[PDB]
Amino acid sequence: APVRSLNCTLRDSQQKSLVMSGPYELKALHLQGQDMEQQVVFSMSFVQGEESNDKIPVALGLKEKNLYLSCVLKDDKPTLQLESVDPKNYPKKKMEKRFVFNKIEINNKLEFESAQFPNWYISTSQAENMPVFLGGTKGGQDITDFTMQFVS
Numbered sequence: 001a002p003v004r005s006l007n008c009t010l011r012d013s014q015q016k017s018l019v020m021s022g023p024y025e026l027k028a029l030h031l032q033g034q035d036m037e038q039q040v041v042f043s044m045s046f047v048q049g050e051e052s053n054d055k056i057p058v059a060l061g062l063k064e065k066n067l068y069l070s071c072v073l074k075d076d077k078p079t080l081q082l083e084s085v086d087p088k089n090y091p092k093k094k095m096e097k098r099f100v101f102n103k104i105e106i107n108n109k110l111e112f113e114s115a116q117f118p119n120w121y122i123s124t125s126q127a128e129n130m131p132v133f134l135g136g137t138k139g140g141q142d143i144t145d146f147t148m149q150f151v152s
């Protein structure tokens with residue numbers, strides 16, 4: 001069958017929203033009212049991969065864009081990028097591993113671990129207007145916890 005997808009927004013546990021802030025750039029900032037309506041709308045696809053009760057493999061595409069969050073080595077480090085794909089082939093159930101996040105539910109929050117890079121997480125900074133990034137630590141200054149909002 002097709003791949004199943006849900007539209008959603010994410011907010012970090014400090015309640016910062018995500019917005020595309022330039023060519024293939026995602027930043028996190030405090031938003032409310034008119035400024036929130038520009039927040040990134042993910043198409044979260046439920047993809048092939050190792051699965052458990054609280055650990056669900058997903059891809060995070062941008063709604064109606066041929067753009068996916070992906071995890072790749074850059075200058076020899078696991079990094080988060082926005083990667084373009086052939087819009088005739090995506091989304092698909094068997095997404096390449098760089099596009100796969102383990103969505104992990106712990107204490108009413110979500111973490112997104114890279115499937116490709118174990119123990120590397122979608123992260124935000126405490127400061128406003130900084131990039132969303134792949135972070136290799138938790139319980140530091142970096143935020144690795146999120147909430148999801150379902151969108152029509």
Ligand SMILES: CCNC(=O)CN1C[C@@H](C)OC[C@@H]1C
Binds near residue numbers: 037038040042063
């Ligand atoms: C051409 C639109 N570019 C944008 O940055 C604005 N949108 C991006 C989209 C993935 O999520 C909703 C948000 C309003």
